[PDB]
């Protein structure tokens with residue numbers, strides 16, 4: 001059908017049909033008379049997976065022979081989503097498979113909807129790791145993603161009476177055709193025990209053993225025949241474990257619980273023992289694998305030339321003391337030499353400045369679970385603080401501030417400090433965030449070692465986030481500038497020469513319209529909900545957090561409603577306001593925000609005077625597969641965090657690439673997006689970081705805004721009085737009380753500017769041609785936000801390796 005989906009050659013289509021029928025019979029053990037759509041999905045998945053195998057084996061062979069420097073990306077989260085379409089895109093098989101399945105009497109798009117998301121992450125951090133793997137394969141890097149194979153990923157969200165309910169995400173129920181178990185490469189991981197000091201060094205003894213069994217998933221690059229590996233560890237008990245008899249076998253679950261479930265808190269640290277076990281499990285198993293591979297190339301001097309370890313936040317920070325443990329206790333290197341190797345091998349990426357997100361582990365947990373690691377951390381801390389003392393003599397407060405050990409009611413280890421001390425590079429994830437790190441929370445470290453601190457602005461993969469989810473847009477672009485931009489996104493700048501082209505303008509607008517119709521239909525079909533496809537689609541999708549200010553959006557929505565009720569017969573640009581995202585199960589305020597959004601919808605969506613001029617929809621169970629549907633349909637992207645709180649954002653970039661305009665604060669990567677596109681082509685409002693600091697200095701008083709803004713006062717009175725909850729008048733008291741007395745994120749402070757900016761949005765939307773021209777200016781300048789650009793910068797500036805676009809032989 002469409003060009004970017006590749007060729008449907010008669011030979012290929014014939015071979016796909018043959019192999020589809022073979023898998024249906026031999027693999028699935030079904031015949032066509034009792035096969036269901038799910039069986040058909042699996043037969044297609046197995047058929048496509050067969051095309052990965054040769055390339056996967058040949059890629060890994062090639063790395064063994066060439067022995068390039070290896071990049072190990074350690075993360076507790078990989079938010080992969082679905083694999084079938086991505087695989088077809090990257091192998092150029094989409095049109096051929098579409099043709100093959102069509103000839104068999106099947107609709108391939110229907111089969112694609114059967115696949116479960118692999119939801120092994122919470123949101124942005126997990127999804128960044130997934131984009132990065134795609135980019136590393138596309139750039140020919142010898143890269144490995146290492147993590148945990150959670151049996152249960154991020155929970156499925158149901159909304160019941162407007163309240164979030166959680167259900168386990170049993171993603172493996174029907175099998176995962178995209179992994180290969182590798183029980184033969186199972187490795188031991190040690191916990192508890194004690195340290196005994198011999199003549200010949202320390203020894204960690206009397207430990208409990210848990211086995212780490214790897215499952216390997218292929219990661220194909222874009223049309224280059226490179227297939228890299230994501231290796232995820234699963235926890236298994238040893239066979240003598242606990243070995244009355246029956247209970248001993250049942251108690252194997254104690255050990256196997258390590259890989260059972262993803263912790264579902266985004267940007268909130270909870271110091272639980274099970275989480276610490278997960279963190280050590282991934283690190284200990286991964287490092288044995290790294291060392292094995294290095295020895296199969298005595299002399300650890302060359303280790304940093306052959307290995308890079310990238311720590312995705314502090315979650316895998318135990319890699320630093322574990323590497324020291326292995327080098328010092330087992331390989332018997334002297335400390336100083338081991339430390340040199342460690343520093344040169346490890347690099348750390350920070351993703352947040354919110355204090356409650358920082359990992360600070362109680363010393364008593366480490367003492368019990370990882371006694372040798374605690375000893376090593378103390379020794380690291382003493383040597384590091386000796387350096388600080390020599391550089392800043394007499395500055396005793398600096399010593400207290402920079403220590404890895406935090407004193408207090410309970411002593412804790414600051415894992416960010418450990419990562420900075422033990423890494424040769426530390427980066428933030430957008431320019432403003434990297435600047436904040438140097439000016440505020442890591443100022444002392446930057447003064448000691450300025451050379452360590454870098455920026456690497458985040459990005460997204462244009463395979464998943466343009467070609468896959470928005471083929472219509474990819475096609476009209478390829479018609480003008482060819483296909484090369486899919487792996488070199490800077491080529492989208494060529495589209496600026498089409499901003500006055502009447503045909504292009506019409507086609508861009510047509511593609512958006514078709515995406516909106518398709519999404520509106522998806523809504524009715526699978527959620528019995530009915531929306532006006534000519535309305536402006538105003539979308540805020542992301543995890544629910546106070547810092548992301550879904551509440552500020554709610555205040556604007558109520559303002560619009562109240563203004564309509566005040567002048568019903570006045571024209572206003574029709575809107576469909578869609579808000580979606582998951583709340584962490586124990587985050588009460590986030591759960592109340594979801595309830596408020598559904599409560600607003602209950603009133604607004606059923607007021608006859610409003611008609612179809614304003615609809616408010618809560619999008620249930622937001623996840624990667626839903627993002628792939630809603631983002632291409634959006635007109636307006638809400639990126640409205642308080643300045644200084646969103647480290648980067650990546651949803652922002654997805655919307656920009658897909659033809660939405662952005663309303664946002666000067667926060668995270670929004671700053672760089674507006675710089676690339678031009679401020680005139682962005683809807684910027686609100687306090688800058690400097691304004692927030694000024695307000696904090698004189699003291700934020702929400703009452704002032706309530707007193708001076710009558711439209712705001714009216715909304716608070718509606719909330720307090722029970723307008724949005726007739727049967728439970730005081731339901732939203734916690735929200736009102738937070739807004740008035742304890743709002744860390746200054747919602748009222750940005751309200752007036754936000755409402756005014758939203759009026760400018762509405763005014764531009766009334767002029768379709770100028771709206772679309774501004775869209776083209778956004779799409780055309782989105783190239784910087786490719787994760788290929790991001791990964792090339794990590795490669796050159798941190799890992800010391802050169803990317804390659806050269807194809808391996810098929």
Ligand SMILES: OC[C@H]1O[C@@H](c2nc(-c3ccc4ccccc4c3)n[nH]2)[C@H](O)[C@@H](O)[C@@H]1O
Pocket residue numbers: 049050052053177178179180181182216217218
């Ligand atoms: O080994 C992992 C899984 O192995 C399946 C199996 N999987 C494969 C396989 C074969 C080829 C593959 C190519 C890329 C995608 C992953 C791939 C997986 N061969 N055997 C078994 O049916 C399942 O119970 C088991 O958990």
Ligand SMILES: OC[C@H]1O[C@@H](c2nc(-c3ccc4ccccc4c3)n[nH]2)[C@H](O)[C@@H](O)[C@@H]1O
Pocket residue numbers: 122124125128263265266267268269270351352357358429458646647648649650668
């Ligand atoms: O860099 C990718 C994204 O990382 C998000 C992020 N996610 C987390 C995160 C994610 C998971 C966590 C679980 C344990 C405790 C703290 C946790 C913190 N920190 N930062 C940022 O909010 C976003 O701006 C950023 O775009």
Ligand SMILES: *Cc1c(COP(=O)(O)O)cnc(C)c1O
Pocket residue numbers: 122123124127541542543622623624627648649650651652654
């Ligand atoms: C991109 C993405 C995120 C990150 O969105 P932000 O708006 O940057 O927080 C979260 N969840 C999913 C499913 C995503 O695809």
